[PDB]
Design a protein around this ligand. Structure first.
Ligand code: SF4
Length: 303
């Protein structure tokens, strides 16, 4: 195979330098295939609390890399492309959070993991799409401030029956903005398929699906549902992961959806990352000290 040169040197350097490679489900297939651990944000977070390796090569977006570093302040965490980021996460600011706390002083601030680390210092608790409902449901308040994703926050309100005040205005992920007409069409084409969509999808898409969950939840659905075909309403990288786990099922994208930021990581720049041991994820000590609190609380409110 024409990529063997890069694959081989990645595997040699990883072993030589004492790295573990962690990847998100939306990384390109070639990188998922060289990673030691591939999963969703919640799975990556739990892995980050548990791993023993002194050095971590993280393959995803910056807020995830930073969470891994917050949970491992004394380990070296590197990323191939320091600009890989989540634009949705980036629209929420400290300024907005403080405005809404004042406006709603007894509402806890619940931040989606897709948020800047500075913003996380201001949060009462963090959540991911897999545990957002459980986390908010276990809080002792009928109103919560939630951001940055309006769709997830609305989904939380539905499932919990609580009032969810979303910040900022119109926070959403462009990648998950499917039209519900694509489900209609796919029902005609594959009448016995099961439709699985992300909670970041708009309400009409969520409401027409058979299942709604994080990518980690998506991967467990075929363990209990015997359907021959699943239609997947998330970023394209998940198709590879699903097909690999369940080669006897068919996985069909709801629509082709690509996260440009998740695609910034390549075999070539991942090799360079191992060769140079760059770019290190560095945070102020204060940010780590402060952002760790709502991350650890997330885990307390699961069990
Ligand atoms: S798929 Fe959407 S929410 Fe996820 S990292 Fe990309 S832009 Fe952010």
């Amino acid at each position: 195979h024409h990529h063997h040169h890069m694959v081989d040197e990645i595997l040699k350097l990883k072993k030589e330098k004492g790295y573990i490679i962690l990847a998100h489900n939306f990384q390109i297939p070639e990188l998922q295939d060289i990673a030691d651990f591939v999963g969703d944000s919640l799975q990556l977070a739990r892995k980050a609390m548990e791993l023993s390796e002194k050095k971590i090569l993280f393959l995803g977006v910056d807020f995830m890399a930073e969470l891994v570093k917050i949970l491992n302040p004394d380990k070296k965490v590197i990323v191939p492309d320091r600009s890989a980021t989540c634009p949705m996460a980036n629209r929420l600011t400290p300024e907005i959070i403080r405005e809404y706390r004042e406006k709603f002083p007894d509402a806890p601030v619940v931040l989606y993991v897709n948020s800047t680390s500075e913003c996380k210092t201001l949060a009462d608790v963090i959540c991911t799409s897999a545990n957002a409902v459980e986390v908010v449901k276990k809080l002792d308040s009928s109103v919560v401030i939630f951001g940055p994703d309006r769709n997830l926050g609305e989904y939380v309100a539905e499932k919990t029956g609580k009032k969810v005040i979303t910040i900022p205005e119109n926070g959403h992920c462009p990648v998950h903005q499917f039209n519900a007409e694509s489900i209609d069409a796919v029902r005609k084409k594959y009448p016995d398929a099961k439709v699985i969509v992300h909670p970041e999808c708009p309400k009409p898409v969520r409401d027409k699906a058979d299942y709604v969950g994080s990518t980690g939840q998506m991967e467990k659905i075929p363990e209990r549902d015997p359907s021959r075909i699943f239609v997947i309403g998330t970023e394209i990288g998940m198709i590879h992961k699903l097909k690999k786990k369940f080669p006897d099922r068919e996985f069909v994208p709801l629509e082709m959806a690509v996260c440009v930021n998740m695609k910034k990581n390549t075999l070539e720049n991942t090799l360079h990352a191992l060769q140079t041991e760059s770019f290190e994820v560095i945070l102020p000590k204060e940010v780590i000290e402060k952002a760790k609190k709502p991350i650890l609380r997330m885990f307390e409110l699961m069990g």
